[PDB]
Design a protein around this ligand. Sequence first.
Ligand SMILES: Nc1nc2c(ncn2[C@@H]2O[C@H](COP(=O)(O)OP(=O)(O)O)[C@@H](O)[C@H]2O)c(=O)[nH]1
Ligand SMILES: Nc1nc(NCc2ccc3c(c2)OCO3)cc(-c2cccc3[nH]ccc23)n1
Ligand SMILES: [Ca+2]
Ligand SMILES: [Mg+2]
Lengths: 67, 423
Amino acid sequence: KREHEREVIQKAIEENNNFIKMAKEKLAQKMESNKENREAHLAAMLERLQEKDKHAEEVRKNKELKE
Amino acid sequence: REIVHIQAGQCGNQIGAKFWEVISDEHGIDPTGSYHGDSDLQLERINVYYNEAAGNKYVPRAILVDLEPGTMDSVRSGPFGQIFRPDNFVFGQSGAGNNWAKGHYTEGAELVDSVLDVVRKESESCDCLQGFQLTHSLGGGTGSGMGTLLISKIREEYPDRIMNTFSVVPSPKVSDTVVEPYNATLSVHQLVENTDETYCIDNEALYDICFRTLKLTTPTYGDLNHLVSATMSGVTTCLRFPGQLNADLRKLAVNMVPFPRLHFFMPGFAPLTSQYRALTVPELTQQMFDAKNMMAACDPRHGRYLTVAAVFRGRMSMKEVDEQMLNVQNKNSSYFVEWIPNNVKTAVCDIPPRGLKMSATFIGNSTAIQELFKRISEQFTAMFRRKAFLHWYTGEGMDEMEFTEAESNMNDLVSEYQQYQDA
Ligand SMILES: Nc1nc2c(ncn2[C@@H]2O[C@H](COP(=O)(O)OP(=O)(O)O)[C@@H](O)[C@H]2O)c(=O)[nH]1
Ligand SMILES: Nc1nc(NCc2ccc3c(c2)OCO3)cc(-c2cccc3[nH]ccc23)n1
Ligand SMILES: [Ca+2]
Ligand SMILES: [Mg+2]
């Protein structure tokens, strides 16, 4: 009976720690994935605007080499 | 000689305190612990329950246990609260939340060693310890779970001593939480294995007595506990006064318990008081055997008596007592098993209780007690088949398997009672 009592209290400790562990790892995975997605959204927007500035330069370089 | 008393949890400590008030009054001990009686019969066996300290002071041989402080503060402030030894109060802070697993496996385990230290200090100074009595309820968390843990450790360290309990059994009619049937099933499993005698005190019966017979529209815990304390006084009278008998807890057990697992007793009391008409011996005898005076809500006509003890208190004719006890046995012979001859025993004590001229206490070992366990088993099953409220327990580390085993043990106890009822 005494050994069973020790197994019960150890199982309770183990389950509390496992719940803490799994919530910590789930949170960390989410908070990384969200950062990566947002930065990729902003990088695509900036890249589209820089491609626009490049096209405006080719236009002015077209008008100069017309004359 | 010496008895050690233990009270655990809210219920246990309230009824325990009431017990010590009543018997301290009978022995002429006041709240300060000074003797102010009129008769040497009060002191001749005082040492059974009280230690003598310096100054001819008498101190109860009593240990007070809880996982929360509240109720022991109420004891310490109660009317006789100063009589208990301060070092005998052992309390935690966390509480047990009406949860047997907290009492037995987690919160309770942290405190049990410090409780055993005080038990050992009391036993060490006993001239000749006869054994132990515990007061507790089965429906909560501390008295139920930690009480049965304590019972197990005491058996392990004092394996040849008698262990006796006064155990309050739960009812939906007087209920604090829905989980009471779980806590009670887990506790009975322990008692079947580790006690010699258990007095079954059913809150259902105490309520019905207060309501129907004593006429009280709203019974409080105080009203129920008054009956409990009067019953316990009755049942300890033969050890406590010079009544010829040369007995100890073991000789009483040997006389009352024919099979080791079937040791659950049904108490009764007469007359029932909340008057002036004195009571004839026929009247005490008729009422003590009446279903309505029983403290466990079981019909004794639904079973048979394995054994009976009757204790009469007051000045009365022993001839008339014998005649009436014989009358009830001879006219109702079919309810008494024929294969244990002379299974009804009678004691008389000269000293009456406070406020009565004559009284009787009843102790029955009847197979009808199976009715109580069946009740609890049905309430258990109705939840357990859907696993309702189980997460409170598995969160403290218990598996379902332990519940299944406890349920099986209690159905076996019921089957045994039925085997001896049909013989
Ligand atoms: N007869 C009686 N029953 C009680 C008393 N206090 C609580 N109960 C019952 O005991 C059970 C609750 O257990 P409780 O003693 O409060 O739990 P604990 O403090 O954890 O040991 C329920 O069945 C209550 O109805 C009391 O003073 N007298
Ligand atoms: N078993 C049993 N019977 C009892 N009744 C009376 C009786 C009188 C004469 C008898 C007899 C029984 O048996 C054969 O002769 C009381 C008790 C008891 C329990 C628990 C704590 C106790 N502190 C003092 C007593 C006691 N225990
Ligand atoms: Ca702790
Ligand atoms: Mg309570």
